[PDB]
């Protein structure tokens with residue numbers, strides 16, 4: 001009933017609500033207002049789809065909570081699958097197994113995809129009979145339209161004897177490797193041809209390629225065993241070999257997107273590394289967000305805009321977001337209520353908009369569900385103004401809890 | 412309404428039967444003898460009188476080429492294209508379900524008498 005992914009703070013975001021000419025609509029695809037920033041993000045999304053330009057960085061700034069991360073999630077949802085979109089918080093690079101620069105270049109390489117295509121003949125049918133003569137043997141496969149016999153090699157007959165030799169199993173035989181995978185007791189049987197030539201397409205990232213080709217049992221990308229990949233031979237040779245796959249009909253590179261959320265956590269070292277990582281031909285496009293104004297860069301006492309050094313700020317473009325008004329706040333709250341299973345009255349929406357414009361926007365978005373659950377307690381159907389007031393009284397907010405501190409606590 | 416008279420030659424699956432090894436070998440031998448022959452779709456007595464006085468030495472017997480080293484390729488019997496499949500009944504090969512159906516309708520166990 002309930003899946004892993006549930007309703008969240010950005011679940012309503014289905015993508016950028018732009019037209020064919022990159023013109024944002026008033027309220028479309030769960031994105032309200034923020035026209036300037038949305039049409040400025042559509043441009044970077046389009047040139048990302050293009051991919052001819054490498055190493056572009058677009059920063060988004062403004063008041064805290066002005067859809068800064070919503071625009072990034074919308075860009076991700078519009079880019080869709082088959083195009084890596086790696087979102088990472090500014091702290092995720094601080095690691096003990098890897099240096100900060102190594103983690104940042106790891107993310108840069110994860111944000112680059114390599115497309116490869118191949119053909120493979122695959123079998124899928126129901127087993128009928130098996131024979132083994134201690135070694136060589138025979139097998140009988142069946143589908144709803146045909147049956148056939150096969151004289152199996154030693155390895156194949158052994159892999160089949162590993163299972164229940166009698167009929168019932170519906171297996172698949174990858175003729176390339178021959179790995180068997182019984183779907184179940186014949187789940188129904190397959191239709192059409194028993195053996196068919198299937199096209200296989202893979203979007204494998206450069207980081208995955210490095211992890212695969214760096215060590216025996218190289219696929220340590222499931223627990224982050226890639227401690228300090230050797231740039232001397234691994235990464236340079238992988239770049240050369242990818243360039244060789246290119247322009248030869250073997251593979252084509254698909255530049256991804258890197259969304260660094262809360263980049264003000266990064267340090268002068270990470271910024272200096274980016275200064276050159278954004279200049280390589282394999283450099284992906286990235287976006288970044290910040291809530292602080294002119295603050296100190298972590299590492300020294302230098303006060304710089306966005307906490308980002310000037311030599312890097314000159315290397316990117318900036319997009320300012322405007323504060324939301326009553327209309328935008330009310331429409332965002334309505335979209336949140338439509339995403340959720342709650343329904344409010346018009347006066348309730350007005351009161352919630354006033355409460356979300358007095359203190360802040362996220363407060364109302366959070367009070368939505370609380371008021372829903374409180375109205376569900378009195379055995380009602382719609383969230384009313386009295387329930388919203390009950391919630392406004394029960395749960396406090398930043399500005400009303402910082403003022404209640406008329407009694408001294410620890411410090 | 413026009414009553415469409417159906418056929419009564421359908422055979423019961425409970426009576427349909429699989430084939431064996433000797434009969435398949437005889438099928439192959441007959442097909443090869445027919446390919447070697449030339450008439451409507453004798454030298455048998457010729458070769459009988461020949462083998463009547465044959466021994467081991469520099470003759471046809473020790474002169475025949477024999478089987479090759481490269482393994483037999485699984486060619487189709489209906490269309491002739493590469494056939495990764497086989498007929499569970501008689502062992503004939505095919506490449507598509509259409510070829511299998513044509514074999515079952517025209518070749519499968521109908522000529523063995």
Ligand SMILES: Nc1ncnc2c1ncn2[C@@H]1O[C@H](COP(=O)(O)OP(=O)(O)O)[C@@H](O)[C@H]1O
Nearest residue numbers: 009030031032034064065066067068069070332
């Ligand atoms: N234009 C918009 N359309 C729809 N929802 C929005 C919009 N702007 C903000 N929101 C919602 O309001 C909340 C604002 O928080 P957010 O902008 O993510 O803060 P920050 O980006 O500073 O971390 C988010 O949950 C977001 O889903």
